[PDB]
Structure formats: C-alpha cells, structure tokens
Write a protein that binds this ligand. Structure first.
Ligand code: CL
Ligand code: CL
Length: 263
C-alpha cells in the first residue's frame, strides 16, 4: 500500500518524504507525512503568483506595469532578471512568468515587493483557509531548510489543498485561473520530477523547488485521460542523493501516487 511503498523509498534513499495526493476539491486521497512540516523552497512561488493575479483581478494591479529594479536587487539565481536589468524593469507579467517557469529568485522578490512582502503572502494563505503555510523571509534566505525551523514551511497536505483551491476552485477569475494553469503547464524546471512519473497524455503543470540540506520539492496539478483532476505535492529531504537522483525520487513518488487515480 501507499504508506509502505513510500516508507520503502525513504529507507532505500536515506530520505524524508512528505506527500499528499488530493482530489479536485482538495480532499485527501493518499498521503504520507502529509501533516509534517517541510520547507516550501521555491514552491511558494505558485501561491505568490496567484496572489499577484488576485490583485490584477481586483483591479489594483496592471499586468503591464513596470516593476523597476537595479543590479543590487539581483540574486545569484536570476536568469531572467539579469537579462532585463539594464532596461531597469520587468513587467508584472514578465516577473510572474519568470518566477514560475524559470524559478527566478529576483523576479520572485519583485513580486514579494509588489504584494507587500512575506507577511502579506502568509495573510493570503490564511484567507484561502490554509492555517499552516507561512512565508517569513525573501529570496534567498528562505531556502535554509534548517532543522527545527518553522520559518518558510508548509505541509504536503496544506500545499496540495491550497494549490487545488487556486487551480480548480473559484478564488481566481476564470481568466486568471486559466493564465496560471497555462503558465504552470509551461514550467521549464519540472520535466524530470512529478511530470516524469505521469503519463505524457495527461495535462500537467507544476512548480519545483530546491533547498539546502538536500531539499527537493514539487507540486503539480494534472488531469487524466478520464478528465479527473488532481493535485500532488511532494516534499523531500535527501542529502545523500545527487541532484538527478533527487528528481528520480520525486518521479518515483508520482508513479506510486498515480496507482490511486482514475486514468
Ligand atoms: Cl473532489
Ligand atoms: Cl534561462
């Protein structure tokens, strides 16, 4: 069964694995360490983008607005922001696309600045009914993944439920929900993680993250050939594995989890 299979992956890979598979409406189908805390790492960028889209939905933000910055605002991993910095800005839309599909840390920090900072993202989690997830730091220090530190954490179940609400629920408008979905489908960093453990006929979108201390995470939505809709969150700490092995572990989790979905 699912619990025993995940436990077996833990033992074999010297890893801690947290996973939740939920239905379209956020109801738990299978989980393992589903209520234990893990660092969000870059998975926070999905609900961050949704918050910015909610501001656009509210008429408070313009997708073409220029978010200005200079070289001091750059981060070590900021492939898009490094290209645009000479112009002095990225638009809201460019920053959303870059933060989600490239995981650009300067674009994420631009958006954190746009929404009012980590406390305002935490408020948004609470507004959605997520009682657990919390952002405390900006990039890059949110990635420290320090044992016993609750800063910048979620649980697999809380993140799965929150993403199900954003992707399949009605908090965003139909326009913004569709935009978020198409952006996640075009994610460029997830080809070897959850998506690699799902049939290529299924529509899938995802947001990955990596952290210190061997953290490697991925949260995906997918729609099967039967038209059934799911969210899968996978949080791992696997300090004894190499990068490619960490992705394979997450793919393996997804293969186990898909034994419980209607194909
Ligand atoms: Cl459901
Ligand atoms: Cl790039």
């Amino acid at each position: 069964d699912f619990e025993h299979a995940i436990s077996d992956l833990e033992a074999h890979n010297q890893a801690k694995i947290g996973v939740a598979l939920v239905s379209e409406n956020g109801n738990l189908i299978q989980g393992y360490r589903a209520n234990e805390r893990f660092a969000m790492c870059s998975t926070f960028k999905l609900p961050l983008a949704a918050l910015v889209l909610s501001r656009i939905d509210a008429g408070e933000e313009n997708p073409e607005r220029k978010l200005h910055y200079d070289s001091a605002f750059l981060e070590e991993y900021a492939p898009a922001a490094k290209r645009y910095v000479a112009t002095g800005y990225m638009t809201v839309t460019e920053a959303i696309q870059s933060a989600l599909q490239l995981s650009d840390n300067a674009a994420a920090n631009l958006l954190l600045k746009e929404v009012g900072g980590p406390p305002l993202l935490t408020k948004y989690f609470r507004s959605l009914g997520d009682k657990v997830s919390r952002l405390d730091r900006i990039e890059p220090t949110l990635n420290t993944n320090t044992p016993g530190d609750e800063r910048d954490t979620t649980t697999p179940m809380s993140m799965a439920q929150t993403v199900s609400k954003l992707i399949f629920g009605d908090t965003l408008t139909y326009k913004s929900k569709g935009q978020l979905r198409r952006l996640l489908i075009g994610n460029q960093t997830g080809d070897k993680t959850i998506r690699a453990g799902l049939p290529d006929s299924w529509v899938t979108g995802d947001k990955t993250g990596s952290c210190a201390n061997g953290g490697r995470n991925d949260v995906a939505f997918f729609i099967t050939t039967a038209g059934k809709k799911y969210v899968l969150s996978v949080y791992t700490n696997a300090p004894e594995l190499q990068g490619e092995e960490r992705a394979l572990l997450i793919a393996s989790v997804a293969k186990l989890a898909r034994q419980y979905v209607v194909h």
